[model samples]
Target: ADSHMLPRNPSMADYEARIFTFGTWIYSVNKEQLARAGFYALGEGDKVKCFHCGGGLTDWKPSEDPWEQHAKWYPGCKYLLEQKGQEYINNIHLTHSL
Candidate 1:
């Protein structure tokens, strides 16, 4: 059976590959943080996709946190669970559920 544990974008598995896509990033979000959160720029305006979940997010506000958004939008992501832990993911979900 297919499991979600597999990475969605294997080409961007490494932070270096993910960061490379942000060479000309014009967004307020920091490329380092985005890359750390498993995002790779989509070569479009602020749009980025997660390497593990294939979740896309864009139109980032100045104070938006990539890890928070990643957990918010894609709670079932294997990468998020591994990197941030179940408690962190649960907290984010609880905050949004209210």
Candidate 2:
């Protein structure tokens, strides 16, 4: 919020209603970053066990193969998002949920 306001200082209206609806910020770096980093464990977490084994619906490299990687991580990331994507969207989103 502040970042958007820092430069232009737009009217701080209800962000949830004004610009975003539900889970709008899911595209942010927090969510995206955590999503990218969690690939090692196949979306597994530090303490939590692997929820979706046998690879996700899709799995491609984020840089070389953004879409392919997207497919790979989408399933697990979606799972992560469902369980804890919104909360960590700012910082925790980047970190492992497990």
Candidate 3:
């Protein structure tokens, strides 16, 4: 699972097209951070699915950081790999272990 050359999930544009499907951004989750972390709302509750990993996360707590959560839960995500690299991705998990 170290190297995955396959396409992970949908593109940003594809996800963006569905952005309106989620309606407005709620303050409960930082929409901008979510987008930067490669996630789009599924228009259901605070649910969000990553555009690159097809990984979804919900019930976000205010203190939860999107990038950290994405890396923690979706380490194999191609977009996350491309955006943060393996070292950083591992670092996320390692940091949480402390």
Best-fitting candidate, scored by lDDT: 1
By lDDT, rank the candidates, best first: 1, 3, 2
lDDT of candidate 3 over 1-98, digit per residue (tens):
22355545545446565455455877576777788787878777888887666788888988888888989888988878888889989999888852
TM-score for candidate 1, please give it. Answer: 0.92
State candidate 2's TM-score.
0.19
Where does candidate 3 stray beyond 4 Å?
1-23
Per-residue alpha-carbon lDDT of model 2 for 1-98, expressed as tens digits? 11121212123122322222222332223333333332222222211111222233222223433223333334334433444444453344254232
Residue-pair clashes, model 2: 9
User: Given candidate 1, what's the lDDT at residue 5?
Assistant: 85
- Show model 1 residue runs off by greater than 4 Å: 1-3
TM, every model: 0.92, 0.19, 0.77
lDDT of each prediction vs. the true structure? 0.88, 0.30, 0.75
